[PDB]
mmCIF file of C-alpha atoms in Angstrom:
data_model
loop_
_atom_site.group_PDB
_atom_site.id
_atom_site.type_symbol
_atom_site.label_atom_id
_atom_site.label_comp_id
_atom_site.label_asym_id
_atom_site.label_seq_id
_atom_site.Cartn_x
_atom_site.Cartn_y
_atom_site.Cartn_z
ATOM 1 C CA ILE A 193 -1.330 79.822 52.506
ATOM 2 C CA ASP A 194 1.635 79.495 53.924
ATOM 3 C CA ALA A 195 3.518 78.977 50.183
ATOM 4 C CA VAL A 196 3.020 82.711 49.843
ATOM 5 C CA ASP A 197 6.934 84.393 51.624
ATOM 6 C CA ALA A 198 7.230 88.204 51.158
ATOM 7 C CA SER A 199 9.580 86.438 47.666
ATOM 8 C CA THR A 200 6.107 85.104 46.063
ATOM 9 C CA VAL A 201 3.826 88.278 47.051
ATOM 10 C CA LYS A 202 6.971 90.847 45.769
ATOM 11 C CA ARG A 203 6.544 88.981 42.161
ATOM 12 C CA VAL A 204 3.112 88.721 41.881
ATOM 13 C CA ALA A 205 2.842 92.232 42.759
ATOM 14 C CA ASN A 206 5.766 92.492 39.279
ATOM 15 C CA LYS A 207 2.929 90.483 37.513
ATOM 16 C CA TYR A 208 -0.077 92.105 38.613
ATOM 17 C CA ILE A 209 0.848 95.773 39.855
ATOM 18 C CA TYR A 210 4.302 97.219 38.353
ATOM 19 C CA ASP A 211 3.860 99.437 35.490
ATOM 20 C CA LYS A 212 0.248 98.198 34.582
ATOM 21 C CA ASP A 213 -2.944 99.224 33.711
ATOM 22 C CA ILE A 214 -5.862 100.117 35.857
ATOM 23 C CA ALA A 215 -9.539 100.929 35.325
ATOM 24 C CA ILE A 216 -10.875 103.896 37.586
ATOM 25 C CA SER A 217 -14.831 104.414 38.562
ATOM 26 C CA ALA A 218 -15.561 107.517 40.873
ATOM 27 C CA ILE A 219 -18.587 109.140 41.888
ATOM 28 C CA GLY A 220 -19.433 112.284 43.604
ATOM 29 C CA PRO A 221 -17.408 115.047 44.295
ATOM 30 C CA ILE A 222 -13.785 114.441 42.427
ATOM 31 C CA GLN A 223 -12.215 116.787 41.004
ATOM 32 C CA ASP A 224 -9.919 116.583 43.092
ATOM 33 C CA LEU A 225 -9.072 113.101 42.288
ATOM 34 C CA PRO A 226 -5.850 112.644 40.280
ATOM 35 C CA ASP A 227 -6.603 112.388 36.805
ATOM 36 C CA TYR A 228 -5.822 109.008 34.535
ATOM 37 C CA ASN A 229 -2.214 109.940 33.590
ATOM 38 C CA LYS A 230 -0.728 110.350 37.507
ATOM 39 C CA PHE A 231 -2.456 107.411 38.674
ATOM 40 C CA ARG A 232 -0.363 105.463 35.708
ATOM 41 C CA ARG A 233 2.953 106.844 36.412
ATOM 42 C CA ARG A 234 2.329 106.086 40.394
ATOM 43 C CA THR A 235 2.105 102.177 39.336
ATOM 44 C CA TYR A 236 6.131 102.669 39.242
ATOM 45 C CA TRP A 237 8.924 103.759 41.524
ATOM 46 C CA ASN A 238 11.679 105.530 39.672
ATOM 47 C CA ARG A 239 14.510 105.650 42.443
ATOM 48 C CA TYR A 240 15.228 101.740 42.006
ATOM 49 C CA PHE B 362 17.744 88.916 25.246
ATOM 50 C CA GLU B 363 15.487 88.214 27.913
ATOM 51 C CA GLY B 364 18.489 88.871 30.309
ATOM 52 C CA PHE B 365 18.985 92.976 29.730
ATOM 53 C CA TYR B 366 15.176 92.752 28.134
ATOM 54 C CA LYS B 367 13.662 92.908 31.375
ATOM 55 C CA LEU B 368 16.033 94.578 33.863
ATOM 56 C CA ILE B 369 15.414 97.783 31.009
ATOM 57 C CA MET B 370 11.757 97.614 31.375
ATOM 58 C CA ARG B 371 11.993 97.053 35.183
ATOM 59 C CA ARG B 372 14.513 98.934 36.893
ATOM 60 C CA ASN B 373 15.691 102.543 36.057
ATOM 61 C CA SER B 374 18.649 102.344 37.060
ATOM 62 C CA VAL B 375 19.128 100.659 34.442
ATOM 63 C CA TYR B 376 17.127 101.636 32.153
ATOM 64 C CA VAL B 377 19.126 105.535 32.580
ATOM 65 C CA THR B 378 22.270 103.106 31.803
ATOM 66 C CA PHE B 379 20.962 102.119 28.645
ATOM 67 C CA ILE B 380 19.904 106.044 27.460
ATOM 68 C CA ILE B 381 23.175 106.920 28.172
ATOM 69 C CA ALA B 382 24.774 104.065 26.185
ATOM 70 C CA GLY B 383 22.682 105.034 23.217
ATOM 71 C CA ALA B 384 23.022 108.847 23.431
ATOM 72 C CA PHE B 385 26.599 107.364 22.939
ATOM 73 C CA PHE B 386 26.405 105.313 20.456
ATOM 74 C CA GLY B 387 23.746 106.617 18.470
ATOM 75 C CA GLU B 388 26.258 110.131 18.142
ATOM 76 C CA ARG B 389 29.227 108.572 17.126
ATOM 77 C CA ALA B 390 27.457 106.565 14.422
ATOM 78 C CA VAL B 391 25.821 109.583 12.857
ATOM 79 C CA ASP B 392 29.085 111.469 13.433
ATOM 80 C CA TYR B 393 30.613 108.951 11.672
ATOM 81 C CA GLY B 394 28.210 108.665 8.677
ATOM 82 C CA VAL B 395 27.938 111.883 8.509
ATOM 83 C CA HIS B 396 31.782 112.346 8.173
ATOM 84 C CA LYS B 397 31.545 109.651 5.142
ATOM 85 C CA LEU B 398 29.176 111.794 2.947
ATOM 86 C CA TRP B 399 31.231 114.519 3.538
ATOM 87 C CA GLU B 400 33.784 113.126 2.606
ATOM 88 C CA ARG B 401 32.505 110.958 -0.643
ATOM 89 C CA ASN B 402 31.180 114.795 -1.688
ATOM 90 C CA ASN B 403 34.088 116.474 -1.716
ATOM 91 C CA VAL B 404 36.503 114.169 -3.553
ATOM 92 C CA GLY B 405 39.690 116.225 -3.979
ATOM 93 C CA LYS B 406 38.937 119.358 -2.169
ATOM 94 C CA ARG B 407 40.550 118.250 0.834
ATOM 95 C CA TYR B 408 43.810 119.478 2.571
ATOM 96 C CA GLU B 409 45.846 116.359 1.725
ATOM 97 C CA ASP B 410 44.383 115.882 -1.811
ATOM 98 C CA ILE B 411 46.910 118.774 -2.731
ATOM 99 C CA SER B 412 49.478 117.660 -5.168
ATOM 100 C CA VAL B 413 52.697 119.918 -4.300
ATOM 101 C CA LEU B 414 51.434 119.551 -0.285
ATOM 102 C CA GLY B 415 55.055 120.013 0.973
ATOM 103 C CA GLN B 416 56.984 121.358 -1.509
ATOM 104 C CA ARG B 417 56.987 125.294 -1.182
ATOM 105 C CA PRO B 418 60.398 126.452 -2.580
ATOM 106 C CA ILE C 1122 16.450 95.868 46.759
ATOM 107 C CA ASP C 1123 19.016 99.140 48.777
ATOM 108 C CA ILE C 1124 21.839 96.982 47.342
ATOM 109 C CA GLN C 1125 20.840 96.493 44.169
ATOM 110 C CA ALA C 1126 19.448 99.643 43.655
ATOM 111 C CA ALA C 1127 22.499 100.824 44.749
ATOM 112 C CA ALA C 1128 24.690 98.774 42.216
ATOM 113 C CA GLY C 1129 22.621 99.783 39.504
ATOM 114 C CA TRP C 1130 22.916 103.457 40.352
ATOM 115 C CA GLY C 1131 26.690 103.704 41.001
ATOM 116 C CA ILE C 1132 26.606 101.556 37.425
ATOM 117 C CA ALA C 1133 24.248 104.051 35.429
ATOM 118 C CA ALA C 1134 27.348 107.370 37.723
ATOM 119 C CA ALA C 1135 30.001 105.388 36.105
ATOM 120 C CA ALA C 1136 28.336 104.832 32.721
ATOM 121 C CA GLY C 1137 27.374 108.692 32.951
ATOM 122 C CA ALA C 1138 31.579 109.699 34.108
ATOM 123 C CA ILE C 1139 32.662 107.406 30.762
ATOM 124 C CA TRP C 1140 29.998 109.243 28.940
ATOM 125 C CA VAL C 1141 30.717 113.001 29.557
ATOM 126 C CA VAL C 1142 34.537 112.951 30.226
ATOM 127 C CA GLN C 1143 35.833 110.556 27.443
ATOM 128 C CA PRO C 1144 38.622 109.186 29.120
ATOM 129 C CA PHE C 1145 40.221 107.411 25.703
ATOM 130 C CA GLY C 1146 43.948 106.778 25.791
ATOM 131 C CA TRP C 1147 43.951 107.621 30.069
ATOM 132 C CA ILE C 1148 43.008 103.802 30.222
ATOM 133 C CA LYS C 1149 46.372 102.730 29.588
#
């Protein structure tokens, strides 16, 4: 646990989160929930 | 190889530069290739192909 | 994430300027 520093978190997040496919499971009143494509775009920041 | 490749899909600033460079080189190559085919299809009809070019009298 | 991004976006801006304005010959 102590070996997980700020640079380690960023490396792992880039391996697993950055521009990665996601799975979505929703139930109930979910018409206002954004579509898969919106959620997929929000996996990366184009300003960097 | 991998150095530029990993920078292009990871940083939008690098990707934007890649788009700008591709537009610069891609358009120049097309312009060069179009002109070469234009010259090949028009042999002997150019301004510098005139035989009497330079002797008006 | 701040200095690297600033350097990257400045490089893109410089590349865009050379692409829009072609200063070939002015490089003397």
